[PDB]
Design a protein around this ligand. Structure first.
Ligand code: FES
Ligand SMILES: [K+]
Ligand SMILES: [K+]
Ligand SMILES: [Mg+2]
Ligand SMILES: [Mg+2]
Ligand SMILES: [Mg+2]
Ligand SMILES: [Mg+2]
Ligand SMILES: [Zn+2]
Lengths: 54, 74, 53, 170, 126, 197, 294
RNA sequence: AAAGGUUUGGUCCUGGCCUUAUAAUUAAUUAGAGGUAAAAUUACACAUGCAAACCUCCAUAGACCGGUGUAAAAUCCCUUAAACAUU
């Protein structure tokens, strides 16, 4: 579902524009699915430490 | 705030990390809430990203945009 | 304007510094060396986090 | 007494009375007029009275005027496309000249109003900040909201000094 | 200042006086000072209850959607504000903290009953 | 330490209709025959802070302070009108009438209170209604169809509620954080426990 | 079904404008405000008449009547009931959408209560917060104190009814209960004391006559219009009463007798007038004076 | 500026100085408490303490915040282009 306020703003716009429907607004999560936090990252784009000793 | 060229304090050389203790039941429930919350927020950020680009295209090359350009030339 | 003048020393310094970095690049055996008694890297003195000990 | 003839021409109100706002195409307006003659009186009056008003509303347009170079006065506009619009202003009153150029190369009232509204899009009355940009600096100014401590002292229980004392007492 | 690196963020800028806090919701580069240069003001938050007992939040939901669509991050207090409004889902830690408070008051209620029972034993002793 | 006591304290408006007022002031304002003593031709931009300090009176008491029977009350409209411009309806600044800053603030508050209660008239501009359209059929001011979760009584999102972790996952965390653990927590109370009092 | 006439009906606006009247001296009475030195123009009789015409055009826009609407219905809609947040907050949050280009009656203003319920802001809450973020000149965030019955009665004693109504239009919304309360209190005070002249040549006369017609108490306004020699207005008022009450005994009697002009007022007296005896007496006296003198 | 004082034996003109208003710093004399705002001789030299960490190792950050007015007529506004140590 959409968040409570954002759902009401969608349904309100439907009625204003003349769209008559009782369909429930739904968010699609397929396009934006997150990898696990421990998924291997890109080593090529990672930094390397400098060569000045402390 | 210090710069990278500043010398470190002598009262904190002994400092070592104290990681927080973990409650197994609450840690897992919280980890799942973050994953589900962040997925919902990514879907909404994408919906907002599309409205920005839709509105931009309508202004740049919408019906009204094209008519006014030719109307002026005529 | 026209009173802004070149800064040769800055130009020389930038190039010279960059050259030295390429010549004296460290190796993985040095950057990632470890002293297992203290669990601290000698190259930088970085002490590993506790959860990794 | 303000110097010169018709010193009203050197007032901001007069300069703002101009109504000819050129389209973005207009880049240059050359004015060719004669200082002596009878059929060029309107052209001479147009340079005297109207050219300041046109420049004031069109600061980026180059107005260059040439005197006694041709038998008759005319106006030539140079547009960004490369087109050249010649206007003949002989036997034409200064008011007539202004109306002619307004029609052919002047922005309409509708276009100018839209630009004004778009300019003010980012000003919001609800926004808080300095007087230069906003109506109210702080929410304390709003009626019913907690007033500024400087004008009106806060209750003791709402003060960090008091809260710290209780924590020590605990 | 001439910043190099960083991102746009939506955060709360603190205003007001001592013991009288007031916040401006703004979109700003993350490296800018808290109360300094911003890009747009997106609303305001008054955290002190008013005469009617209402904490007043103003959200420019059209411009907020615009800046989230352009990559603007959100600070954690602003993520909490959007959750209370209903524009965003409730933040994970808003729910967790509410659970912790429920578990902490349950202990207090139980202890008070135990103390009352201990006091009842004192009543039995007379 | 004995300031005189006015007989008109209860009903201040009475004084301005009495014969004593007419003889002293006639039909002119009470500040008409007052002049400020100051060096130079341009006077200071503020009047003296107050004419009365601890029952003592200053050298040249202001129009309000010099006459004790005059009372600055929102109900004494006839006195208040003398301190407001009849043509523009603007309250005069203190240097104009020569009243002290204390009485000027008191007069300003009495004038503002009198106007708010309608005792003292002022010009009300004619303003148009706020909204061009007066419809109340938009969802914001109307009824939104109730969401499915709201009708059933469920949380808006399933993860709002506490969902017991699987036992295998609780063991996986006890191994990962072995040696730095807290006591396992069960389901939280269904409602907020009533605050003990 | 024959539609009930509305306040904005072109026929109703015509009749209400006529009975209201116009007076360039009353409509443009000098404002007590910061003044500037007057300007002067030399004008011929044609130019002066043109300027008077523009003054009458402006007096028409100045006399535009304010809306007459029915009382709004309380907003009682719950968007959500998140009970997880019960007891975690002590004060209500009020969230206002302050996007510039939204009509004020189409903005979303919600309230998160301490119990966790997310509900829509009530009408009183909507008006307060819209003043705080879109402040309107003339309006105050909190309801002023002049509208209290004791304070309003003071304004009525000073014959400041047009002011009570001009303030009620600056502060309250036309559909609010407070707006309707003050207007109906002012209109009732004018009736009892026969002070109908106070609102003539003002934008508030139409609503007053509208209120009397709907409440079937035009008797006082007719008696006063006749005594002021405004008998064309009195006839138009009886036409408006026969338009909003078509099935009334008076409206059916005028159709039977095809009454017009002064006849319409006589029909009303016999049929539906609360005080018919007086309407005839004043109407008769007017006829005697007109006939006797001219 | 709504002006004023001051050249002469006297009048008029010209013309400068000064007075009256407003504000900041310092000083003399004097002074209860409370709320708020501000804090400032010096790019001269500095004892001492603190001001940058985080984290299952890699990385990321310490390029910010904070400070001063050093240098320079140094700038403003506007155009084009390309990038970012970014999102
Ligand atoms: S200026 Fe608003 S609280 Fe002080
Ligand atoms: K002089
Ligand atoms: K001399
Ligand atoms: Mg990692
Ligand atoms: Mg000092
Ligand atoms: Mg800074
Ligand atoms: Mg210098
Ligand atoms: Zn005084």
């Amino acid at each position: 579902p959409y968040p409570p306020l954002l759902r009401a703003m969608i349904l309100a716009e439907r009625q204003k524009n003349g769209d008559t429907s009782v369909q429930e607004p739904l968010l699609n999560l397929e396009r934006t699915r997150m990898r696990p936090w421990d998924y291997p990252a890109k080593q090529e784009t990672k930094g390397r430490a400098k060569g000045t000793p402390v | 705030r210090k710069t990278r060229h500043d010398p470190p304090a002598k009262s904190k050389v002994g400092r070592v990390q104290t990681p927080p203790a973990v409650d197994p039941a609450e840690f897992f429930v919280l980890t799942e809430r973050y994953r589900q919350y962040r997925e919902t927020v990514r879907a909404l950020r994408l919906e907002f990203t599309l409205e920005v680009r839709r509105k931009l295209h309508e202004a740049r090359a919408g019906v009204l945009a094209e008519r006014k350009a030719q109307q002026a030339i005529t | 304007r026209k009173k802004v003048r070149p800064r040769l020393i800055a130009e020389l310094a930038r190039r010279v510094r960059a050259l030295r970095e390429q010549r004296n690049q460290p190796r993985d055996s040095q950057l990632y060396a470890l002293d297992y008694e203290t669990l601290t890297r000698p190259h930088s003195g970085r002490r590993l986090p506790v959860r990794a000990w | 007494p303000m110097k010169g003839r018709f010193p009203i021409r050197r007032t901001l109100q007069y300069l703002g009375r101009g109504d000819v706002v050129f389209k973005e195409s207009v880049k240059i307006m050359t004015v060719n007029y004669n200082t002596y003659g009878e059929l060029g009186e309107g052209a001479r009056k147009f340079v005297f009275f109207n050219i300041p008003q046109i420049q004031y509303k069109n600061p980026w347009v180059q107005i260059m005027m040439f005197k006694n170079m041709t038998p008759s006065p005319f106006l030539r506009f140079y547009l960004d496309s490369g087109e050249q619009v010649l206007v003949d202003v002989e036997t034409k009153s200064n008011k007539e000249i202004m109306e002619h150029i307004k029609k052919i190369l002047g922005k309409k009232e509708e276009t100018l109003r839209e630009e004004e509204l778009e300019k003010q899009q980012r000003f919001h009355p609800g926004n808080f900040g300095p007087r230069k940009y906003c109506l109210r600096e702080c929410m304390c100014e709003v009626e019913g909201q907690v007033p500024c401590p400087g004008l009106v002292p806060l209750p003791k229980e709402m003060t960090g000094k008091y809260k710290a004392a209780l924590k020590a007492s605990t | 200042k001439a910043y190099h690196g960083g991102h746009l963020t939506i955060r709360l800028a603190l205003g007001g006086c001592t013991n009288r806090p007031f916040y401006r919701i703004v979109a700003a580069h993350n490296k800018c000072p808290r109360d300094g240069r911003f890009v747009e003001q997106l609303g305001s938050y008054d955290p002190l209850p008013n005469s009617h007992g209402e904490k007043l939040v103003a959200l420019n939901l059209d411009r907020i959607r615009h800046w989230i669509g352009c990559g603007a991050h959100l600070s954690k207090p602003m993520e909490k504000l959007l959750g209370l409004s209903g524009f965003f889902p409730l933040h994970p830690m808003m729910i967790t903290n509410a659970e912790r408070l429920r578990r902490r008051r349950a202990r207090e209620v139980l202890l008070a009953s135990q103390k009352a029972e201990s006091e009842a034993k004192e009543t039995e002793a007379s | 330490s004995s300031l005189p006591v006015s007989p008109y304290e209860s009903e201040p408006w009475k004084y301005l209709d009495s014969e004593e007022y007419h003889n002293r002031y006639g039909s002119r304002p009470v500040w008409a025959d007052y002049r400020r003593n100051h060096k130079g031709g341009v006077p200071p931009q503020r009047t003296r802070k107050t004419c009365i300090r601890n029952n003592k009176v200053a050298g040249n008491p202001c129009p309000i302070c010099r006459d004790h029977k005059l009372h600055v009350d929102f109900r004494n409209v006839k006195l208040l009108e003398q301190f407001v411009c009849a043509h523009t309806g603007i309250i005069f600044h203190a240097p104009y009438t020569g009243v002290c800053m204390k009485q000027h603030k008191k007069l300003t508050q009495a004038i503002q209170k009198a106007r708010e209660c309608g005792l003292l008239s002022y010009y009300v501009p004619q303003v148009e209604p706020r909204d061009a359209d007066f419809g109340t059929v938009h969802g914001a001011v109307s009824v939104t169809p109730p969401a499915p979760t709201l009708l059933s009584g469920e949380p808006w999102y399933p993860w709002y509620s506490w969902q017991q972790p699987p036992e295998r996952e609780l063991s996986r965390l006890r191994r990962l954080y072995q040696g730095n653990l807290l006591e396992e927590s069960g389901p939280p109370p269904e409602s907020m426990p009533e605050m003990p009092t | 079904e024959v539609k009930k006439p509305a306040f904005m009906d072109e026929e109703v606006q015509r009749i209400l404008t006529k009975i209201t009247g116009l007076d360039l001296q009353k409509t443009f009475r000098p404002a007590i405000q910061p003044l500037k030195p007057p300007t002067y123009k030399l004008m011929t009789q044609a130019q002066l008449e043109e300027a008077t015409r523009l003054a009458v055009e402006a007096a028409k826009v100045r006399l535009k009547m304010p809306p007459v609407l029915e009382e709004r219905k309380p907003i009682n809609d719950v968007l959500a009931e998140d009970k997880i947040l019960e007891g975690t907050e002590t004060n209500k949050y009020v969230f206002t959408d302050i996007s510039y280009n939204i009509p004020h009656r189409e903005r979303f203003i919600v309230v998160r209560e301490p119990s966790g319920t997310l509900r829509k802001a009530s009408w009183e809450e909507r008006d307060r917060v819209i003043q705080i973020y879109f402040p309107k000149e003339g309006r105050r965030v909190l309801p002023p104190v002049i509208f209290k019955d004791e304070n309003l009665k003071t304004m009525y004693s000073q014959d400041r009814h047009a002011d009570v109504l001009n303030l009620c239009v600056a502060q309250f919304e036309p559909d609010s209960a407070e707006y309707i309360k003050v207007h109906h209190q002012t209109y009732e005070d004018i009736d009892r004391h026969g002070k109908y002249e106070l609102l003539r040549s003002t934008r508030h006369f139409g609503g007053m006559a509208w209120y009397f017609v709907n409440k079937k108490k035009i008797d006082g306004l007719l008696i006063d219009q006749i005594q002021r020699d405004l008998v064309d207005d009195a006839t138009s008022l009886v036409q408006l009463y026969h338009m909003l009450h078509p099935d009334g005994q008076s409206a059916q009697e005028a159709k039977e007798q095809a009454a017009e002009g002064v006849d319409l007022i006589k029909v009303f007296a016999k049929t539906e007038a609360q005080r018919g005896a007086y309407i005839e007496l004043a109407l008769q006296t007017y006829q005697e004076i007109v006939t006797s003198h001219s």
